[PDB]
A = this chain, B = another copy of it.
Amino acid sequence: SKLLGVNSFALRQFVEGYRGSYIPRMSPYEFLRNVNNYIIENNPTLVDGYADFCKHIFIPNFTEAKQSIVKITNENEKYIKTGYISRRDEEIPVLSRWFPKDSPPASQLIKSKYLDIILYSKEQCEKESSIMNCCLQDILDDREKNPDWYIISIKAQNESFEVPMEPITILRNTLIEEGGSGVPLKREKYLESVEFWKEHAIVSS
C-alpha cells in the first residue's frame, strides 16, 4: 500500500550464487512492475509478519525461481555444506549450512509454485539505513516514487504461508548495529524456528 518499492537488500537475489531464492533472467525493476501489476489486478492480502513493520504477500511464481529449501533426510545429510558466510559486506559472517547447487538434493528442483514477498515499512528501512548506511539505491516503480512498503526479501516456495526464519536471523535481529531489524528475542518463536530448521536446509545458488 501503495504500490511497492524494492529495497536495496533484495538486489542480492538477482545475482547467481545467492544462498536461497535466486531470481533468474529478470531485472529487479522488471520484477517490481510485475509484482505491482499483480497487486493492481488481483488486490492480494497483506499479511502480518513477525513485527508491525513487516508484511507479506504470497503470489503465484511468475519467475523461473526454483524451490530453495529441502527437507534433510538420512539419505541426503551427507551433502550438507557448512561455513561462515555474510549476507553482505557490512555484516559479520555467521555459521551457516546448505545444500550446494551441484549436489543431488538440488538437481531435482524445479520452479516453485509461489513467491513469499517480504515487505518492510518505509520507516523500518530508514531506521536500519541510518545505522549501517550502504549508499545503495532502491529500485522504484515509475508509477510509485514514494512507496509505504519495500520488498526486502523474496522466498521461492511451494507453501502459500510464512515459513519460519532461520534461527540465526532471529538472533541477529537482536542487534540492530550488526544489523538487525532490532527486535528482542522471543524464545517461543526461536524454538518454532529451530524445530523447522533442524530438518531443512537452504539450497545454494
Residue numbers of A with Cβ under 8 A of B are 78, 80, 82-84, 92-97, 167-168, 171, 174-175, 177-178, 185, 187, 190-191, 194, 197-198
Contact = CB atoms under 8 A, between A and B. Distances in A.
Contacts of A198: 83-84
Given A82-B82, A94-B167, 18 more contacts: A80-B82, A82-B97, A83-B198, A84-B167, A84-B194, A92-B187, A92-B191, A92-B194, A93-B194, A95-B95, A95-B96, A95-B97, A95-B168, A95-B197, A97-B97, A171-B171, A174-B174, A178-B185
18 contacts: A80-B82, A82-B82, A82-B97, A84-B167, A84-B197, A84-B198, A92-B190, A92-B194, A94-B167, A95-B95, A95-B96, A95-B97, A95-B168, A95-B197, A97-B97, A175-B185, A177-B185, A178-B185
A187 to B, nearest CB: 7
A78 B82 CA distance: 10
A198 B92 CA distance: 13
A13 to B, nearest CB: 22
A41 to B, nearest CB: 41
Contacts of A84: 167, 194, 197-198
Copies in the complex: 2
Nearest to A83: B198
Nearest to A94: B167
Contacts of A190: 92
A178 B95 CA distance: 19
Contacts of A78: 78
Nearest to A197: B84
Contacts of A187: 92, 178
A82 B200 CA distance: 12
Contacts of A96: 95
Nearest to A82: B97
Nearest to A172: B171
Nearest to A171: B171
